[PDB]
Structure formats: C-alpha cells, structure tokens
Write a protein that binds this ligand. Structure first.
Ligand SMILES: CN(C)c1ccc(O)c2c1C[C@H]1C[C@H]3[C@H](N(C)C)C(O)=C(C(N)=O)C(=O)[C@@]3(O)C(O)=C1C2=O
Lengths: 1022, 50
C-alpha cells in the first residue's frame, strides 16, 4: 500500500492526526490507579453477637448462615472465621471474571433466607455483605494533639460531620470509619442494684418502654365526620435524646414514694459502641477513615478532591482536630507516571542523538520523532478501547516496549538513506524501492510478534490478569506501530529526506566486520557449535535462576506486628505498642514520619492480645542512602524488637499488590472431613506440622495460621436448683449476659442522629471469676439470689478461633517452598505428609495454592503454539518449510545474556523479567527475518550468491541493528537499571532487557548470517 | 407520630450508604409525615438499569 501512500502523503497525515486525536482524548477518559484488578472476586460476610465465643458463634450463626450458600452461581470456594469476640467473617472467592455486583447479590440475597434462623441478638447487629478489599486508596487520620477528645469523641465527629461529606466525592468508592459514633452507655453495678432488688432485666425492660417511639393517628384523614376542618398529626411518645433524660428512668418505686432511677442503679454517659480496639496516632488519640478507590475513577484525581473536601471543613470544632494522612497511595503512583514518561521522552532523545551519528541529517531524525509519539498516543486509545487503564502494569507495558516501535521507525527511514545512497535514486523512488523491500517483512514480522506475545493473556488467575495487562499493551503498541510504518513513515521520510571520528571510523569497521564474517563461513558448522554451547548454557542458567511475581518495593509505609502471648491484655499490649512507637520515633527519627498503632487488629485474630502498628516514613527524598530505605529500616526494627519481653514483635514491608497472592509460599487447609472433633483435628494438625519440620530438606516454615486453645472460665446453671428457688433460667442468663458482655437495648437520637444504646455492668464488677458473686437475680417470691445458690464454675480450654473451609471444620497452615526447591515440588511433599494422617482428616489447597495448582504450569503448552504459529506465519513470509528455521535459532541468543540477571546481578525470573525476555526476542527474530530477507530477495531476484548474498545481506544491515540496539540500551540504562526509590520493577524491566539485548545483537551479527548459511544449503544440497 | 423522625432515622441512613454505585448522577429523597420515605437514584443515560 505505502507506495499509494507515498504518492498522497497529504492524506497519511490525516490518518496520523485522527490517531493522535483518539489517543489524546483517550488519555482524559483513562482511569488511573496503582494496579488493576487482579484478585478473583471475593465477598465477606460479617456478623456480631456481643459476648460469645467460637462454639457459641460457630453453632449459633456461622454454620447455619453457611448451610445456605447453595444456589449462588460461579463460586470457587468459601472459607469462614468464628472467633471469641462475637465476630464472624465468611468470605466467598468466586471464578475469575464473574460479575462481582451480581455475585454479591445472590450471596447476600440468599443470606436473606437464613436470617429467620439467626438468633435475635445477631439479627439486631445485622449481618453485612460486601466485596472483599481490606487495604486501599488513602486513609486519612483525625487526631487531637491537646488531650481533649478521646478515641470515641474523635470517632464521633468523624462520623457525624465529615464521614459522608467525603463518602460523596468524585471517587470515594466506599468509606470505612476507624471507630464508632457515640452510643448511650449504661454501666450498672450489682451492688447499687441488688440494694433495690432490681436486676439487669428490670433495667433493660424500662430503657425499652421508657425510650421507644409510639404511633397515634392524625385527626381527620381516615374517614372523618361531615364538615370537619382541622386535620393534624398527633405526636405521642418519642425517644429520649440525652444522658440527662436517660438518667431519669423510673426503675423502682416502694412504699416511701421511693424514686429509684436508672441514674442510681448505674451510671449514664455517651461513649463508643465497641470498646475493644485502641487507635492512636503517634501516642495521640486517633480515629481515622479509610477510603477505597471508586471503580473507574482516578487514583490521582480523587485523592486530590479528598484533600479538597477535607480542606474547607477543617476550619471547625474547638480543640485542634488535625487531619493526618498516614497513608496515601498517590505520590507513589505519580512518581511512577513521572518516570516512564521520561523513559519514553528520553528514549526518543536517544533516537535523535543516535541516528544523527549515523545518517548525516536532521530532517531524518525528525521522522522517528514524529512516529514514536504518534504510536504511543494512540495506543493510549486502544487501551481505552479495551477498557484498560493507566496503572503501573499498563505503563511499563509501553516501556518494555519502547524499544520495539522505536526500532520499527529507524528500520524504515534507514533503508531509504541507503537506497538513495548505494547508487540510488531521489527520495521518492528511494522509498518506493526501500519501503518495499522491508514492506512484506514489516508485515509478516507483524504476525510473528503477535505470537510470542498474544499467548500471554491466557494464563491463570490472580496473575495472568497482570500478564494480560502487559500482553495487550505491547501487541497494541507493537502492531499499531507496524501499521504507521506502512503508512505515515513511508510518506514521512520520502518528502523531507535529502564527525571524522565516525563515518571515517565506520565505513571500514563494517568492512572489517563483513570481511571478518566474510570467510569464517566456509566450514559453515564452525560456530554451529559454540552456539550449541550457548543454548545448553541457557538451559542451565534458567533452572538456576530463582522465581517470583513482582519484586517488593519501598512504598510510603510498612508495619510492625505485636503479639503478647496467650491471654494478654489491651493494657499490657499497649505498652508494647508504645515501645514499638518509640524505637521508631526517636531512634529512627529521620525516617519514621508517623506510626499509626492499633491493638485489637491482630492479623490472625483479634482480642486484647494482639495489635499491629502501621508506620509511615518520610519522603523517599529525605530518605537517601539504601540504609534509609524500607527494605533496610525494617531490618533494624525486626532485630531491635527482638530483645523484647514475652511480646513477639515483627516488622515487614508490604508486598507490591497489597490485595493479591503474596509469597511464592503455599496455603494449605486441613479439613475435618467427618465426626473428628476440634481435638482430633488438632492432634491431626499437629501430626503433620511436626512431620514436616523433619524435612527442612524440602524447606519449610509450616505454621498453623490460627490460634491455640486457651483456657476459659465456664459457668454452669444448675437447672434443678434454679427450679427449686423461684429463679427463671431466662432471668439468670440475661443478668449474667448483659452484666459481663452487655446487651444493646434499643436506639435513641442524638443531635439529629440515631445511635445505639448499650447497657452493661461497670468494668469494676466484671474482671475476675470472683465478682460473679456480686451479681444477684430477683426470684419468684421476690428474693435476690446469688450465683453460687444456683450455679457452679470450672476452668477449661476451648478455642478462641474456630475456622472452617468450605462448610467444614478446618484449620489453616501456611509455609514456604525451599531455598533450593520449587513452590510446586514443595506442595507435593506437604501432600504426601498429608497422605498418612488419621482417617477422618482430609486436605485441600486454597488461595495462592489454588491457582498455582489449577492452572499454574502452562508456559510450555502455550508458547508451543506460538513457536508453531511463528513457524507457519514465518514460513510463508518466505516460501519454504525450512528457511524460517534460519529465523528461529535467534531465540536462544537473546535469552542468554538476558539470563545474566543471575551471573551479573542478583535477581529472579519475575514477571517483569519475562515480559522483557519477550520484548527482547522480538528484536532478535525481527533482525533475523530481515537479514534472512535481504538474504534471498537479492539472492532470489538478482540470482546472486548462494553465499555472496549472505555477506552483502548482512552488510546492508549492520547499521540498522547497530543503530537501534544503541539508542535502546542507553534508553533502558538510565534510572532504569540504576535506581533509588519508587522503582524495583525499574531494575526489573531494564536489567532483563539490558543484557540479553547486548547478546542479541553483538551475537546475532555473526550467527544469523550463519544459520541462514548452515541452512539454505542443507536443503536441496548435493 | 413522627416529624423529622423518619428522615434521619430511615432516610439519612439509607442515604448514607447510597455511595459507590456507578453511573449515579443525582440522588433526591423526600421524607414524609405519614412516615413514608422515598429515596430516588437516577443514573447517567445509557446505564443498565438492572
Ligand atoms: C484495624 N481497622 C482498620 C481499624 C483501624 C483503626 C480503628 O480505630 C478501627 C479499626 C476497625 C473498626 C471496626 C469497627 C466495627 N464497626 C464499623 C462499628 C465493629 O463492629 C467493632 C466491634 N468489634 O464491635 C469495632 O470495634 C469498630 O467500631 C472500630 O472501632 C474500628 C476501629 O476503631
């Protein structure tokens, strides 16, 4: 076609303008987020039962609920937690791209039929259903740095005057408060209470009647009387709205006009609804608000508006309520965007610098400078065409590819500056002939690069989604390019197209070169070996080279994990947090910007026992030396926190994609598969655990991710004694209930806001198995009766956290592979070890292990089919079932050298490596096709030298390669390959391409012109 | 028997949550004396009502 286009180039700028327009407007329609969505869609199911425990939750609620997740569509598997604090999560991951909105329906929708069987304590707290993400966009924090407001106070505000305000802002796909909102507290004491013969119940059943909301008709409305006039609305009883009115509740009255008020039997005051998770920001009372993306909005965009809205409203409410930002995934994104953009921009500067040094010109270097931004822009419109988005993955997608289009450009405008040179004609007739000798090659290598690329985007699950990111990016760029280099370039270099230390130091090294390559080709199969080494070499390096997904990076933050033992205590846990806080602020004072610490958020349960402390460092800048980086600061910490009392305190850097498949580790789940109680499974679990320590061969750290039985204090109502005295089994339980774990009466309104009303014993009368003796119940005949009278107490163990995989009591263990061996082969062991447990016990693999198992290994099976299409395609580029062979044998060259990510640096086969390892095999076989083209072409058209051509071929070729291969490496060499911060993947992408690219050229200059020779002569031979 | 009462009790609440939903242009509710409430969400044209 281009020949018809070189003729009207006037048009092949309209084609170029459109594209640019589309790609420009597409830029704006692009959402921007750190990563895309790559976890399969899960759905948690939470639930409460104030003061329960695992059995009393697993059997009142998590079961039941779970006997009903039947009906729901595409479900992968379903686990569930039941811990000792009334909580029940019940997430349900679902097949790859099922519609999340529609799965959450049904899941939820189908809950709706179990509620009838949930107990009334729970259906009041309500079971919510939502989409599993627990860590996203930014997390504003609201502290007070002048001890006026407490946790609960600050929460409230944040709830009452700003939570929704954000919540509805272009983005804000969901808010999640970091505390409560006030609630009417009503802390009784058996004493002041037993003195009036009233129990909790009496209190409960008063806060009801007294604080409720009645009904009372209009006046007219419903059928009235003839000729009436006033209709008005009657306003009967309506909820109390204060600790005042609450204080005053007629609880008792006895022959004295005795006025026993709720105010006596206990003590009233606003407070928080839950009280068992202490948030505080750098030793200050705090009550943050986390904010998730938006689905299709813009990480940058919306962060800014959140910052807007927050601004504007901070001019409010006394005592400094200073808004902090202990986490914002945005700076990190913007700095990536800011790089890459330079990587591209600069990558071009390179093609201007390089190329000059080669084509005495200027109006020549102007061509690839008008082709690149044309090809980039415009792929930005194919991204918007497939709904894709501007995210880390998608960006490096074009950088890993910067070198494939750039090339393409150079390749054309440098054949014309040869043809109108090697006794050529003018610009026109040059192009025509030039752009027409690479014409069909420029195509064909299209179809080729489409394979050895397409194949990705066919992979597994959590991953493979990533891979897709890369695949369509490249192929969309790549092919989009090949299309301008058949339309705008062939009309752009025609029409435009007309130091001693070079030219006068090249025209002769070429000659030395081709000459050097000249001969050394008689014994053809000279270097047929040597090469065979190379291949064999790779086949070594590969195995040797470790594996990963995404190299971890320094980001704004990281965390410390505290874990006081067995049954510790919030208070005992705080101090540990205060240290953690300390040995961070003040001993790391030029890096820790803040620590946000909370106790109650363990990572393997909750309870006064564990807490965790999220620390936010200072800007990558003020953090210069490698010693001032995360993968460094945590080292100190981790250690510096060993040498601590009974308080395991870890620290560690979060992974690339928080919400995704972590370590190359495994996730194993031991299933109850029959009768076998907790115990039996435990003995079972313990069998296998111990069994696998005896095997650090296949490495390990096999660890139950869950909680050992702890001891627990066991009441026990004597039914009979209950009956004998006048004492209701119900009345007992509410009193003991309410007292100790507290009950949630009903609601009331407080400054225009409905808010719960709880009522439970002061803390003083509920700390120790004694105290139980303080509690009295009113019996039939009207005499208070103490526990001992109708109940006995024993210690015992039980589980504070009962976990269970699809339907069935389970226990989850995780662990690594082997510093030597593969995640894969390490699972297999774990499985044989499973193979011999007691009979009852079954085993099943979830999680990362689920995919890894299912799909996993396909790299072979897929690229088989590419290497076939590559052949097929390639064969008919030429016209033989053999010649294409001379194009293939390039693959190994580029691979080795690319694999000296092993022997040169200290890296791993991680994704960013493999994508590059593909980008690299494209220029490599591209080079091949051309050299094997000009190989025949003048061998076939001018019947030239069976070997004479080959030499000439490579001759008219050493400059294209040397040209491109230069601007590339240098282009990839910058911060790409030598970096400080917001990087990781920068080292990733470069290093891979950086080497391998070396070998791809500096080693194919000799082989490829071989190869072609070693063949094209093995076929129709004698 | 419920001035405001309804709104701020049922209205505000159901409203608090109507956030997230894609393609939303404007929300508008009218809390009523009779105790009746009517939240209303309306999406960008094209959007898929189911
Ligand atoms: C760890 N998670 C991110 C945080 C971080 C900081 C916090 O300050 C908080 C949380 C969890 C949330 C959960 C919420 C929950 N809900 C939204 C009312 C909740 O059910 C409880 C509960 N266990 O009763 C809380 O303690 C809780 O009120 C709470 O105080 C939190 C809180 O203070």
């Amino acid at each position: 076609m281009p020949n018809f286009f070189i003729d009207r180039p006037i048009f092949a700028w309209v084609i170029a303008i459109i594209i640019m327009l589309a790609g420009g407007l597409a830029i704006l329609k692009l959402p921007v987020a750190q990563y895309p969505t790559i976890a399969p869609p899960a759905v948690t199911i939470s639930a409460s039962y104030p003061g329960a425990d695992a059995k009393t939750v697993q059997d009142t609620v998590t079961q039941v609920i779970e006997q009903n997740m039947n009906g729901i569509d595409n479900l992968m598997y379903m686990s569930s937690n039941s811990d000792s604090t009334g909580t029940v999560q019940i997430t349900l991951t679902f097949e790859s791209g099922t519609d999340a909105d529609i799965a959450q329906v049904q899941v939820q929708n189908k809950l709706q039929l179990a509620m009838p069987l949930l107990p009334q304590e729970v259906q009041q707290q309500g079971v919510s259903v939502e989409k599993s993400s627990s860590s996203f966009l930014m997390v504003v924090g609201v502290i007070n740095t002048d001890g006026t407001m407490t946790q609960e106070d600050i929460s409230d505000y944040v709830a009452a005057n700003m939570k929704d305000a954000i919540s509805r802002t272009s983005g804000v796909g969901d808010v999640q408060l970091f505390g409560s909102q006030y609630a009417m507290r009503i802390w009784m004491n058996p004493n002041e209470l037993n003195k009036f013969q009233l129990t909790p119940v009496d209190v409960i059943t008063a806060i009801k009647a007294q604080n409720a909301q009645v009904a009372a008709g209009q006046l007219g409305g419903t059928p009235p009387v003839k000729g009436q006039q006033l209709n008005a609305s009657i306003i009967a009883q309506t909820r109390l709205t204060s600790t005042e009115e609450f204080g005053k509740i007629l609880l008792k009255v006895n022959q004295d006009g005795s006025r026993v008020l709720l105010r006596d039997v206990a003590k009233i005051e606003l407070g928080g609804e839950n009280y068992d998770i202490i948030a505080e920001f750098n030793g200050q009372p705090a009550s943050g608000l986390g904010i998730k993306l938006a689905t299709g909005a813009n990480a940058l965009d919306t962060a800014a508006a959140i910052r807007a809205e927050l601004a504007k409203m901070e001019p409010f409410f006394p005592s400094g309520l200073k808004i902090v930002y202990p986490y914002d995934t945005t700076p990190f994104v913007k700095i990536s965007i800011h790089e890459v953009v330079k990587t591209l921009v600069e990558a071009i500067i390179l093609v201007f610098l390089v190329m000059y040094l080669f084509l005495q010109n200027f109006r020549a270097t102007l061509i690839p400078t008008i082709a690149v931004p044309v090809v980039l822009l415009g792929t930005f419109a194919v991204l918007a065409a497939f709904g894709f988005s501007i995210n880390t993955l998608t960006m490096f997608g074009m950088v890993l590819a910067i070198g494939l289009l750039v090339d393409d450009a150079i390749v054309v405008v440098e054949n014309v500056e040869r043809v109108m040179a090697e006794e050529g004609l003018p610009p026109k007739e040059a192009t025509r002939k030039s752009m027409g000798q690479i014409q069909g090659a420029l195509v064909g290598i299209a179809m080729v690069l489409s394979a050895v690329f397409v194949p990705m985007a066919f992979f597994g699950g959590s991953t493979g989604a990533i891979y897709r990111q890369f695949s369509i990016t490249i192929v969309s760029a790549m092919a989009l390019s090949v299309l301008v280099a058949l339309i705008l370039t062939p009309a752009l270099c025609a029409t435009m197209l007309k130091f001693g230390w070079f030219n006068r130091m090249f025209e002769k090294s070429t000659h030395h070169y081709t000459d050097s390559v000249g001969g050394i080709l008689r014994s053809t199969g000279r270097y047929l070996v040597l090469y065979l080494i190379i291949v064999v070499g790779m086949a070594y390096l590969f195995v040797r080279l470790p594996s990963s997904f995404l190299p971890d990076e320094d980001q704004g933050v990281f965390m410390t994990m505290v874990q006081l033992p067995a049954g510790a205590t919030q208070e005992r846990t705080q101090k540990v947090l205060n240290e953690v806080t300390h040995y961070y602020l003040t001993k790391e004072k030029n890096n820790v910007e803040s620590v946000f610490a909370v106790n109650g958020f363990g990572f393997a349960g909750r309870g006064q026992n564990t807490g965790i402390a999220f620390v936010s460092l200072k800007d990558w800048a003020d953090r210069p030396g490698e010693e001032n980086k995360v993968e460094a600061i945590t080292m100190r910490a981790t250690r510096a926190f060993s040498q601590i009392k009974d308080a395991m305190v870890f620290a560690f850097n979060l992974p690339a994609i928080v919400e995704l498949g972590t370590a190359t580790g495994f996730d194993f789940e031991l299933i109850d598969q029959a009768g076998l109680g907790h115990e039996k499974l435990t003995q079972a679990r313990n069998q296998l655990l111990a069994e696998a320590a005896k095997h650090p061969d296949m490495l390990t750290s096999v660890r139950p991710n869950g909680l050992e039985d702890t001891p627990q204090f066991k009441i026990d109502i004597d039914q009979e004694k209950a009956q004998a005295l006048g004492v209701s089994i119900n009345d007992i339980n509410t009193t003991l209930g309410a007292a100790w774990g507290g009950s949630y009466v009903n609601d009331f309104i407080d400054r225009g806001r409905v808010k719960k009303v709880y009522v439970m014993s002061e803390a003083k009368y509920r700390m120790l198995p004694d105290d139980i003796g303080d509690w009295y119940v009113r019996a039939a005949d009207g005499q208070m009766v103490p526990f001992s009278a109708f109940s006995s107490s024993r210690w015992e163990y039980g589980s504070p956290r009962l976990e269970r995989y699809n339907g069935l009591p389970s226990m989850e263990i995780l662990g690594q592979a082997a510093p030597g061996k593969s995640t894969g082969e390490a699972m297999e062991l774990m499985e044989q070890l499973a193979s011999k447990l007691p009979t009852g016990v079954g085993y099943d693999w979830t999680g990362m292990s689920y995919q890894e198992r299912l799909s996993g290994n396909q790299a072979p099976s897929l690229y088989a089919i590419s290497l076939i299409v590559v052949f097929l395609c390639l064969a008919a580029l030429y016209e033989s079932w053999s010649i294409p062979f001379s194009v293939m044998l390039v693959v190994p060259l580029g691979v080795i050298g690319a694999l000296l990510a092993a022997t040169f640096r200290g890296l791993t086969n991680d994704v960013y490596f493999q994508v590059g390892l593909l980008t690299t095999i494209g220029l490599s076989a591209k080079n091949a096709i051309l050299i094997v083209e000009f190989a025949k072409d003048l061998m076939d058209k001018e019947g030239k030298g069976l070997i004479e051509a080959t030499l000439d071929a490579v001759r008219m070729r050493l400059r294209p390669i040397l040209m491109t291969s230069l601007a590339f490496i240098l282009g990839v060499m910058p911060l790409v390959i030598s970096t400080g911060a917001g990087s990781g993947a920068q080292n990733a992408v470069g290093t891979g391409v950086m080497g391998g690219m070396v070998t791809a050229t500096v080693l194919a200059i000799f082989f490829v012109p071989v190869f072609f020779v070693v063949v094209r002569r093995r076929f129709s031979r004698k």
